[PDB]
Design a protein around this ligand. Structure first.
Ligand SMILES: Cc1ccc(C(=O)Nc2cccc(C(C)(C)C)c2)cc1-c1cc(N2CCOCC2)ncn1
Length: 254
């Protein structure tokens, strides 16, 4: 009945600082091989820092799926630390918008399917991501999708923009709809608008929505319809991940 999540003291080492996330700094480290370590820089944590650490461990520890970044364990001695697997590769954001990787349609649909697979797993455990975007979709060996929260108005559903509890399974679906747009256009939405306030205001008001005419010629019509359903302005009109997953599986077979 015990998962033995608490890593024994004096075992984790950290090397190169790769970034930051939530409560601390992210490093490439060692613990039974390469690992990523999210660690709080101070030895005396504030009650908020300790609470944020506890919440993150609490959600991560409930996940065991190939499309979810693998949580390996935690430590509180000498510092608060969360350990995950180490993946060679890059985020979907880095591929599409930084190095501009040209994926074949088959691979773009497969990346969509794997993301929907991981999202369906999270929602089944009542876990709302709250920040799904291409940056949080890691391409392990540039093939397998690993969803994480690695550190975002473009992916925000209109009701999340407008604002007490605007987050739901459907606001995650809307963010997935934007990811579908990124895969099918190779672009971020609203690239012809240079004003962030305007984007926030217009999306929240329903005056602005992604330009779906920008999707590639080889994008299946069923994918374009799914994307439109995921992006509905009214949250109750959006499909849930079991239906999204079933639609992607159907269009992939053609
Ligand atoms: C070290 C670490 C700890 C924790 C997390 C994290 O994803 N926490 C998290 C928080 C809220 C909700 C959720 C969900 C998914 C359940 C919705 C997850 C991410 C990292 C991490 C790993 C990393 N790697 C480098 C490349 O190789 C793979 C690992 N690079 C940056 N950061």
């Amino acid at each position: 009945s015990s998962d033995d999540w608490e890593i024994p003291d004096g075992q984790i080492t950290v090397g190169q600082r790769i970034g930051s996330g939530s409560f601390g700094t992210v490093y490439k480290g060692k613990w039974h091989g390469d690992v990523a370590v999210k660690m709080l820089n101070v030895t005396a944590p504030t009650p908020q820092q300790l609470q944020a650490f506890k919440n993150e461990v609490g959600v991560l520890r409930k996940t065991r799926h190939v499309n979810i970044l693998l949580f390996m364990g935690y430590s509180t001695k000498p510092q608060l630390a969360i350990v995950t697997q180490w993946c060679e590769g890059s985020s979907l954001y880095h591929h599409l918008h930084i190095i501009e990787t040209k994926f074949e349609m088959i691979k773009l649909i497969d990346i969509a399917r794997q993301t929907a697979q991981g999202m369906d797993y999270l929602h089944a455990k009542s876990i709302i991501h709250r920040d799904l975007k291409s940056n949080n979709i890691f391409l392990h060996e540039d093939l397998t999708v690993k969803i994480g929260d690695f550190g975002s108005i473009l992916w925000m559903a209109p009701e999340v923009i407008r604002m007490k509890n605007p987050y739901s399974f459907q606001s995650d679906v809307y963010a997935f709809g934007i990811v579908l747009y990124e895969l099918m256009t190779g672009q971020l939405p609203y690239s012809n608008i240079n004003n962030r306030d305007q984007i926030i205001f217009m999306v929240g008001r329903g005056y602005l929505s992604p330009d779906l005419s920008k999707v590639r010629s080889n994008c299946p019509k069923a994918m374009k319809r799914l994307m439109a359903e995921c992006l509905k302005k009214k949250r109750d009109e959006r499909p849930l991940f079991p239906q999204i997953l079933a639609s992607i599986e159907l269009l992939a077979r053609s």
